[PDB]
Amino acid sequence: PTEFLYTSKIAAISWAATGGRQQRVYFQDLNGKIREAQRGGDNPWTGGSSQNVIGEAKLFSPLAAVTWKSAQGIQIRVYCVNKDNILSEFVYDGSKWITGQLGSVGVKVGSNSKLAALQWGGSESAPPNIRVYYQKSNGSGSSIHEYVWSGKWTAGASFGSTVPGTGIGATAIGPGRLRIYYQATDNKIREHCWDSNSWYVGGFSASASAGVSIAAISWGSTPNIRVYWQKGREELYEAAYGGSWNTPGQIKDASRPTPSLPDTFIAANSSGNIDISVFFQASGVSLQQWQWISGKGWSIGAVVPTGTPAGW
Amino acid sequence: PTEFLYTSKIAAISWAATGGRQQRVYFQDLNGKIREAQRGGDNPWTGGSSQNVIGEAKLFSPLAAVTWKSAQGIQIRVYCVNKDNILSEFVYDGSKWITGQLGSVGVKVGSNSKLAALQWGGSESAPPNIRVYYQKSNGSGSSIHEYVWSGKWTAGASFGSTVPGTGIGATAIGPGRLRIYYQATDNKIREHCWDSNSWYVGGFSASASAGVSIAAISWGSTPNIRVYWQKGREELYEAAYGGSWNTPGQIKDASRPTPSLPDTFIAANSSGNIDISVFFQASGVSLQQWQWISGKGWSIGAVVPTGTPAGW
Ligand SMILES: C[C@@H]1O[C@@H](O)[C@@H](O)[C@H](O)[C@@H]1O
Ligand SMILES: C[C@@H]1O[C@@H](O)[C@@H](O)[C@H](O)[C@@H]1O
Ligand SMILES: C[C@@H]1O[C@H](O)[C@@H](O)[C@H](O)[C@@H]1O
Ligand SMILES: C[C@@H]1O[C@H](O)[C@@H](O)[C@H](O)[C@@H]1O
Ligand SMILES: C[C@@H]1O[C@H](O)[C@@H](O)[C@H](O)[C@@H]1O
Ligand SMILES: C[C@@H]1O[C@H](O)[C@@H](O)[C@H](O)[C@@H]1O
C-alpha cells in the first residue's frame, strides 16, 4: 500500500526548462497533508514522501495549481480549502513554501465543490493574473464563482448552472482569453468564454456520464485546446480543438482497460509544443499518468511515488 | 466521504442475547485507529466514530476477533499488528478495553499477512481456548502458523502451502474441532482440519480468483459450515456444508452488481440458529453488509456508520 489518499483530488503543472520538461504534481496523503512529487525530463519521478509536504487542508479537499516564471524564480500557487471550508493558498516564492494571502479574505466554499485555476501574463517583467473558480453550494443547478487576483484579491463573475459539485476545467488560451468547462444539469459538458470584454456561452458541448472529473489545457497560436473528462473505472475521454472541435474519443490501452479506481479524479498539465500528461488514481493506491508523445500517441507512463506507510 | 480507510481489513462478531442479536464490527480509520460499530437486534447501527476507538495498529493491518461470555461479562479479543509487525491484542474484559498480553510475546508477522482467530470452551464456568492464525513470510508457498492460548500463549502448528498473503478463514465447528480455509498456490481454496489428535487435509476444495478474501462460520449439530470468499469488484461466493458440500454459488443482487470496491476485504459473523452477516467495503467509502434471513435469502442490509471527516 501507499500513503496516497483514496479519492484524493489531484493538481498538476509543468513548464519547459533548459535541460528538459519540469513537472510537479500535488496530492493529499492519509493525514490531510498536501504532498509534491517532481519530474525533470524523462528521469523517474521523485518526492511524494512525508518530506515533501507543502501544506495541509481538510481531508478530500479540492485542489488546483498554477505556475509562472518571475524574477525571483519559479512561482507556484496551490489552492485548497481548510476544515472550515475556507479557500486557502500555498505559495512557492521561487525559493521556499509559505502561506498565501487568499485565506485571510475568508472565501467560503461548498463542502463538495471542486476547484480550478488559471494564470496569464506572469513573467520576469510582469505580474500574473490569477483566476480561481469554485462553487458556494452543493445543490443541483448551482453556479460557478470566480475570484480574481490583479494586485489584490476581489470577487469576480458567477455563471452557469451545474450538476452538484461539478468538475471544473479552466485554461487561458491566450492573454486575457479564458475558457471554463463544467458539467451542466443535463450532464453535458459546457464551455464558458471570456475573450476581452464579457462572458458568453461557448460552442463546445458533449455528453458525459454524471459526475465526471474534468481537466483542460491549451497551447499555440490557433490556439489548440484539449478537454479531458473521466468517470472512475471508465475510460478517459478527450475533445480536441485545433480551429474547430473534433468528435470526443477515448484514450485507452487494450491491455489495461479502465485502469482508474471508482469515484476518483484526474488532473492534466502541458508545456512546450507540445507535452501533455493526464494523471489518475489507480490500484495501489497509486498515482499514475497517461503520457502523450506527439505523433505517436498515448501510453501509460511511469508511476509517481506516493509514500510507503510504516510496517510495509 | 467517511473516515473508513480504503482497503482496511474487517473483523466481526456476534452473539445471541435476550432482547436480540448483538453484533460488533471492527475496522480501521484514516489514522490507523481500530474503531468499533455496534448493533442490537434490528435497530440501526451505532458507533464507528472517533469516540469508538479501541486501539491502534499499523495502517492496513490485518484484523481478527473472537468473543465468549464469562463471569465478568462479555469477553472480546481483537488481533492486529503494530508498526513493527508484532502481533498485538486488544482486550474487552467485560467492562472496559485494555491491552492484552500477546504483544509481549513478540510474535513477528509477515507484512502482507492476514489474520484469523477462533475460540471454543469459554463460558462463565470455563476458560477459553483461543487460536490465532497468521503467516511469517509474504512469499508464495508460505505456510500458515498458529499461536495457542490455553492458560498462556505458546506456538502451535504450521501447515499448508499458500498464495502470498492468502486470505484465512477459521471456525470451531465443535469443541476442539477446527477447520481452516486458505488459498493454495494453485488458487484453489483448501481446508485443514483438527478433530482431536492431529491435523489433516480436509475434503473441501474450490476454484477461486487469485487473492480472494476468505471468511468462515459454523453452527449446529451436523454441523453446518459456510465458507465465503470474494475478490473486490466481483460477486460474493458461498460454499455450504450441511453434512456434505454443495456447489459454491454466488450471493448477489441483480440491481446492485459487484457492490464492493477493488482490492477490499470481507468478514462474516453468526449467532443463534441461524443469523449470518457478511461485511464488505463499498463506494462511500462505506461499510456494508449482506444479511441472511433463513428461508427467505440474502439481501444487502443497513449501512454501518464509519465517521465523517471535518469539513463535511
Ligand atoms: C477558441 C474558441 O472560442 C469560441 O469560438 C468557442 O465557442 C469555441 O468553442 C472555442 O473555445
Ligand atoms: C466436517 C467435515 O470434516 C471433514 O470430514 C472434512 O473433510 C469436511 O470437508 C468437513 O470439514
Ligand atoms: C519549483 C520548486 O522546485 C524544487 O525542485 C522543489 O523542491 C520545490 O518544491 C518547487 O517545486
Ligand atoms: C500573486 C500573489 O502572490 C502573493 O504572494 C500571494 O500572497 C497572493 O495571494 C497572490 O497569490
Ligand atoms: C461488549 C461491549 O458492548 C458495549 O456496548 C460496547 O460499548 C463495548 O465496546 C463492547 O462492545
Ligand atoms: C484469554 C486471555 O485473556 C487475557 O486477558 C489476555 O491478556 C490474554 O492474552 C488472553 O487473551
GROMACS .gro file of C-alpha atoms in nm, chain B residues 111-311:
model
  201
  423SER     CA    1   0.394  -0.751   0.643
  424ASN     CA    2   0.128  -0.876   0.399
  425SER     CA    3  -0.010  -1.149   0.626
  426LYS     CA    4  -0.379  -1.177   0.709
  427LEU     CA    5  -0.512  -1.295   1.045
  428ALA     CA    6  -0.783  -1.537   1.156
  429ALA     CA    7  -0.884  -1.649   1.503
  430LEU     CA    8  -1.128  -1.891   1.665
  431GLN     CA    9  -1.233  -1.978   2.018
  432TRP     CA   10  -1.419  -2.257   2.198
  433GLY     CA   11  -1.498  -2.363   2.552
  434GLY     CA   12  -1.517  -2.017   2.703
  435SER     CA   13  -1.813  -1.973   2.936
  436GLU     CA   14  -1.899  -1.842   3.281
  437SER     CA   15  -1.755  -2.161   3.430
  438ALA     CA   16  -1.473  -2.245   3.189
  439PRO     CA   17  -1.167  -2.069   3.040
  440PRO     CA   18  -1.149  -2.010   2.663
  441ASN     CA   19  -0.929  -2.187   2.410
  442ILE     CA   20  -0.804  -1.934   2.155
  443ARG     CA   21  -0.615  -1.998   1.831
  444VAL     CA   22  -0.469  -1.723   1.611
  445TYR     CA   23  -0.350  -1.795   1.259
  446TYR     CA   24  -0.101  -1.587   1.065
  447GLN     CA   25   0.194  -1.608   0.829
  448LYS     CA   26   0.562  -1.525   0.880
  449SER     CA   27   0.660  -1.458   0.520
  450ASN     CA   28   0.489  -1.297   0.220
  451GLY     CA   29   0.641  -1.537  -0.031
  452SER     CA   30   0.444  -1.780  -0.246
  453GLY     CA   31   0.428  -2.129  -0.099
  454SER     CA   32   0.445  -1.997   0.259
  455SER     CA   33   0.271  -2.191   0.534
  456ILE     CA   34   0.017  -2.090   0.795
  457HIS     CA   35   0.128  -2.065   1.158
  458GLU     CA   36  -0.075  -2.089   1.475
  459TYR     CA   37  -0.043  -1.945   1.822
  460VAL     CA   38  -0.225  -2.109   2.108
  461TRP     CA   39  -0.375  -1.977   2.429
  462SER     CA   40  -0.472  -2.230   2.695
  463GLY     CA   41  -0.361  -2.055   3.011
  464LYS     CA   42  -0.064  -1.893   2.840
  465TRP     CA   43   0.047  -1.816   2.484
  466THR     CA   44   0.259  -2.076   2.305
  467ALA     CA   45   0.346  -2.162   1.947
  468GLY     CA   46   0.117  -2.409   1.774
  469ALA     CA   47   0.132  -2.594   1.444
  470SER     CA   48   0.224  -2.481   1.095
  471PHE     CA   49   0.072  -2.623   0.776
  472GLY     CA   50  -0.025  -2.570   0.413
  473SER     CA   51   0.142  -2.401   0.117
  474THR     CA   52  -0.038  -2.083   0.016
  475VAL     CA   53  -0.053  -1.792  -0.225
  476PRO     CA   54   0.128  -1.480  -0.093
  477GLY     CA   55  -0.068  -1.318   0.191
  478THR     CA   56  -0.359  -1.560   0.148
  479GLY     CA   57  -0.697  -1.490   0.300
  480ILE     CA   58  -0.765  -1.707   0.603
  481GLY     CA   59  -1.095  -1.838   0.732
  482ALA     CA   60  -1.115  -2.015   1.068
  483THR     CA   61  -1.402  -2.164   1.262
  484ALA     CA   62  -1.452  -2.402   1.555
  485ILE     CA   63  -1.721  -2.642   1.428
  486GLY     CA   64  -1.729  -2.816   1.763
  487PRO     CA   65  -1.539  -2.829   2.093
  488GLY     CA   66  -1.182  -2.892   1.985
  489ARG     CA   67  -1.279  -2.941   1.619
  490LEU     CA   68  -1.115  -2.683   1.393
  491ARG     CA   69  -1.144  -2.601   1.023
  492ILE     CA   70  -0.913  -2.353   0.850
  493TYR     CA   71  -0.962  -2.229   0.493
  494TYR     CA   72  -0.697  -2.064   0.281
  495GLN     CA   73  -0.593  -2.034  -0.083
  496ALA     CA   74  -0.331  -2.279  -0.208
  497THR     CA   75  -0.061  -2.194  -0.461
  498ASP     CA   76  -0.289  -2.325  -0.736
  499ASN     CA   77  -0.561  -2.072  -0.643
  500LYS     CA   78  -0.791  -2.339  -0.505
  501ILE     CA   79  -0.938  -2.280  -0.162
  502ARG     CA   80  -0.829  -2.565   0.065
  503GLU     CA   81  -0.926  -2.687   0.410
  504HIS     CA   82  -0.716  -2.806   0.703
  505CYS     CA   83  -0.871  -3.000   0.990
  506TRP     CA   84  -0.816  -3.083   1.355
  507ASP     CA   85  -1.075  -3.314   1.510
  508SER     CA   86  -0.897  -3.438   1.820
  509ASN     CA   87  -0.541  -3.566   1.792
  510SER     CA   88  -0.392  -3.436   1.467
  511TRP     CA   89  -0.412  -3.203   1.167
  512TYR     CA   90  -0.507  -3.333   0.822
  513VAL     CA   91  -0.611  -3.205   0.479
  514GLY     CA   92  -0.989  -3.173   0.458
  515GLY     CA   93  -1.207  -3.281   0.169
  516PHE     CA   94  -1.330  -2.934   0.071
  517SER     CA   95  -1.183  -2.775  -0.240
  518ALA     CA   96  -1.295  -2.499  -0.478
  519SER     CA   97  -1.155  -2.280  -0.754
  520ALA     CA   98  -1.136  -1.907  -0.692
  521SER     CA   99  -0.981  -1.591  -0.835
  522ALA     CA  100  -0.631  -1.523  -0.703
  523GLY     CA  101  -0.615  -1.316  -0.384
  524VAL     CA  102  -0.974  -1.352  -0.265
  525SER     CA  103  -1.065  -1.254   0.090
  526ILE     CA  104  -1.198  -1.555   0.287
  527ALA     CA  105  -1.431  -1.599   0.586
  528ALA     CA  106  -1.593  -1.897   0.754
  529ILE     CA  107  -1.866  -1.964   1.010
  530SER     CA  108  -2.037  -2.271   1.153
  531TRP     CA  109  -2.316  -2.382   1.384
  532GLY     CA  110  -2.539  -2.673   1.484
  533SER     CA  111  -2.505  -3.046   1.547
  534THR     CA  112  -2.447  -3.160   1.190
  535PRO     CA  113  -2.254  -2.928   1.199
  536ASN     CA  114  -2.323  -2.668   0.928
  537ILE     CA  115  -2.038  -2.469   0.776
  538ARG     CA  116  -2.045  -2.173   0.535
  539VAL     CA  117  -1.725  -2.060   0.362
  540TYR     CA  118  -1.724  -1.720   0.191
  541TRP     CA  119  -1.475  -1.566  -0.048
  542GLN     CA  120  -1.468  -1.254  -0.256
  543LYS     CA  121  -1.241  -1.060  -0.487
  544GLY     CA  122  -1.313  -0.686  -0.480
  545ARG     CA  123  -1.550  -0.577  -0.757
  546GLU     CA  124  -1.659  -0.938  -0.816
  547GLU     CA  125  -1.952  -1.116  -0.654
  548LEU     CA  126  -1.953  -1.296  -0.320
  549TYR     CA  127  -1.924  -1.678  -0.328
  550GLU     CA  128  -2.059  -1.921  -0.069
  551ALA     CA  129  -1.983  -2.290  -0.017
  552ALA     CA  130  -2.226  -2.460   0.221
  553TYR     CA  131  -2.169  -2.778   0.422
  554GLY     CA  132  -2.472  -2.942   0.580
  555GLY     CA  133  -2.337  -3.294   0.609
  556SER     CA  134  -2.158  -3.270   0.276
  557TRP     CA  135  -2.052  -2.981   0.050
  558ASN     CA  136  -2.276  -2.829  -0.217
  559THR     CA  137  -2.154  -2.648  -0.530
  560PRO     CA  138  -2.029  -2.295  -0.449
  561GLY     CA  139  -2.271  -2.030  -0.569
  562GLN     CA  140  -2.276  -1.650  -0.587
  563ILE     CA  141  -2.467  -1.430  -0.349
  564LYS     CA  142  -2.579  -1.129  -0.547
  565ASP     CA  143  -2.837  -0.863  -0.616
  566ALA     CA  144  -2.936  -0.816  -0.982
  567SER     CA  145  -2.998  -0.446  -0.924
  568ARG     CA  146  -2.664  -0.389  -0.743
  569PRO     CA  147  -2.392  -0.586  -0.927
  570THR     CA  148  -2.044  -0.630  -0.777
  571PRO     CA  149  -2.106  -0.371  -0.499
  572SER     CA  150  -1.762  -0.399  -0.340
  573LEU     CA  151  -1.461  -0.187  -0.431
  574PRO     CA  152  -1.149  -0.345  -0.584
  575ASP     CA  153  -0.882  -0.491  -0.355
  576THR     CA  154  -1.110  -0.490  -0.048
  577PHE     CA  155  -1.181  -0.746   0.225
  578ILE     CA  156  -1.476  -0.917   0.394
  579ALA     CA  157  -1.562  -1.053   0.736
  580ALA     CA  158  -1.853  -1.270   0.849
  581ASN     CA  159  -2.024  -1.346   1.178
  582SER     CA  160  -2.306  -1.567   1.300
  583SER     CA  161  -2.504  -1.650   1.613
  584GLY     CA  162  -2.825  -1.821   1.722
  585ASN     CA  163  -2.985  -2.056   1.473
  586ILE     CA  164  -2.913  -1.902   1.248
  587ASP     CA  165  -2.817  -1.541   1.176
  588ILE     CA  166  -2.537  -1.453   0.936
  589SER     CA  167  -2.378  -1.124   0.826
  590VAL     CA  168  -2.107  -1.078   0.563
  591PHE     CA  169  -1.940  -0.737   0.562
  592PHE     CA  170  -1.772  -0.567   0.272
  593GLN     CA  171  -1.635  -0.227   0.173
  594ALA     CA  172  -1.821  -0.024  -0.089
  595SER     CA  173  -1.828   0.319  -0.251
  596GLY     CA  174  -1.860   0.591   0.012
  597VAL     CA  175  -1.622   0.474   0.140
  598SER     CA  176  -1.887   0.274   0.325
  599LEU     CA  177  -1.905  -0.037   0.542
  600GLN     CA  178  -2.189  -0.256   0.423
  601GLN     CA  179  -2.333  -0.598   0.492
  602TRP     CA  180  -2.511  -0.884   0.327
  603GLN     CA  181  -2.771  -1.023   0.564
  604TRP     CA  182  -2.920  -1.367   0.574
  605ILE     CA  183  -3.280  -1.423   0.674
  606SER     CA  184  -3.317  -1.801   0.698
  607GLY     CA  185  -3.562  -1.940   0.445
  608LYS     CA  186  -3.601  -1.609   0.258
  609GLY     CA  187  -3.248  -1.536   0.149
  610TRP     CA  188  -2.972  -1.283   0.115
  611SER     CA  189  -3.017  -0.908   0.085
  612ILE     CA  190  -2.790  -0.608   0.138
  613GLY     CA  191  -2.866  -0.460   0.478
  614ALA     CA  192  -2.818  -0.137   0.669
  615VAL     CA  193  -2.501   0.069   0.621
  616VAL     CA  194  -2.261   0.075   0.916
  617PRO     CA  195  -2.153   0.427   1.024
  618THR     CA  196  -1.782   0.493   0.977
  619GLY     CA  197  -1.749   0.861   1.067
  620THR     CA  198  -1.749   1.192   0.882
  621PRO     CA  199  -1.429   1.397   0.847
  622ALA     CA  200  -1.415   1.764   0.949
  623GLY     CA  201  -1.528   1.996   0.672
   0.00000   0.00000   0.00000
